[PDB]
């Protein structure tokens, strides 16, 4: 069986709030950054 | 054309656009009344310490808020449909002009008597003469006779485009393989602008429409000389 309770019903860990901040930063940051880099990609092709 | 900081519609140039302005004033008043009434009621519900949390009966007040909106919708639909049918009235034009949309410019054809036709491209910003409007001027304008009922036929030779002139209340899609009709009638002489209104690719933002309304006499001379 699986772990249950606050902080245990999720695919990411919230054991360390700083490691968590790193996770969330990469997660949400990669999403927000993607369009900018795709725009850069399109501009650097021609 | 639109001027800096404009809030509403461009001034009406045709009797039909005038008709739309009054219909919009009518509709907008209802929009303001209903939206402010809702905002008011929200504030009214939220500003009292008095309570009533038990079951409230609804089959009584729902008659009110079903019949009222129904009446209001009819009060909007009546003039809306009167105008709609008015735009469809048989009018019998004195001239027929065709316009074909292209990527990315418009071509015009006046083929009632002579076989006159030309392309109409946007004047590049680098090329504007002093006092000319950026993105709106074209090399060849659509010379037309003022105070006359004209039939405009719109189509396209490639992708979809849409021929629009806001001041005249016009917007007719340019569809390849189809000939759409609309009628034009300017109450005044002058220059009237519009822009392509259907996404057509790379230069969708840069293929304007410019109508030049002049008296019949000048229209004729122009006709001849444009052979």
């Amino acid at each position: 069986h699986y772990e249950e309770g606050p902080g245990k019903n999720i695919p990411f860990s919230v054991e360390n709030k700083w490691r968590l901040l790193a996770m969330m930063t990469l997660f949400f940051g990669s999403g927000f950054a993607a369009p900018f880099f795709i725009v850069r990609h399109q501009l650097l092709k021609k | 054309m639109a001027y800096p900081m404009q809030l509403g519609f461009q001034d009406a140039t045709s009797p039909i656009m005038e008709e739309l302005l009054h219909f919009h004033d009518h509709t907008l008043m209802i929009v303001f009344l209903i939206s402010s009434l809702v905002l008011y009621i929200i504030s009214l519900m939220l500003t009292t310490k008095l309570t009533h949390t038990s079951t409230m009966d609804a089959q009584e007040v729902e008659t009110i808020w079903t019949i009222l909106p129904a009446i209001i919708l009819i009060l909007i639909a009546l003039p809306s449909l009167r105008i709609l049918y008015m735009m469809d009235e048989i009018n019998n034009p004195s001239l027929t002009v065709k316009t074909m949309g292209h990527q990315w410019y418009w071509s015009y054809e006046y083929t009632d008597y002579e076989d006159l036709s030309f392309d109409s491209y946007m004047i590049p910003t680098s090329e504007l003469k002093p006092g000319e409007l950026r993105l709106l001027e074209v090399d060849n304008r659509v010379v037309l006779p003022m105070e006359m009922t004209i039939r405009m036929l719109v189509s396209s030779e490639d992708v979809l485009h849409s021929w629009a002139v806001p001041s005249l209340g016009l917007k007719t899609d340019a569809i390849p393989g189809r000939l759409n009709q609309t009628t034009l009638m300017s109450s005044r002489p002058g220059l009237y602008y519009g822009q392509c209104s259907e996404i057509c690719g790379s230069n969708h933002s840069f293929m304007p429409i410019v109508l030049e309304l002049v008296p019949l006499k000048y229209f004729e001379k122009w006709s001849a000389s444009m052979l």
């Binding site: - | 009292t48 310490k49 008095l50 309570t51 009533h52 949390t53 038990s54």
Partner: protein
């Protein structure tokens, strides 16, 4: 529905039941405050007495607090009800929220 007197009577009767228990006391007050009204002094009277029979002083004071709350902005209703309930408050030894300093934040 029913007349004002019939509603009042129905609630006076409810709280006047000799063997009314704690659950029924709470159910009655919690239900009563859901209506668009400040209960009549006669209903409050009956409820305060039920508190006495249940040896519940704290609830008697809470009931007076809810009556003031139900009046909202109408500051003249509580003083009047407390006026009308003075005999009973005296008799049962019920101190008002004010007298207990329960009205200060």
């Amino acid at each position: 529905h029913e007349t004002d007197e019939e509603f009042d009577a129905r609630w006076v009767t409810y709280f006047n039941k000799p063997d009314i228990d704690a659950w029924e006391l709470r159910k009655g007050m919690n239900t009563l405050v859901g209506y668009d009204l400040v209960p009549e002094p006669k209903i409050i009277d009956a409820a305060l007495r039920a508190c006495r029979r249940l040896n519940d002083f704290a609830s008697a004071v809470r009931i007076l607090e809810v009556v003031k709350d139900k009046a909202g902005p109408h500051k003249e209703i509580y003083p009047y009800v407390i006026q009308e309930l003075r005999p009973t408050l005296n008799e049962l030894g019920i101190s008002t929220p004010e007298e207990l300093g329960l009205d200060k934040v």
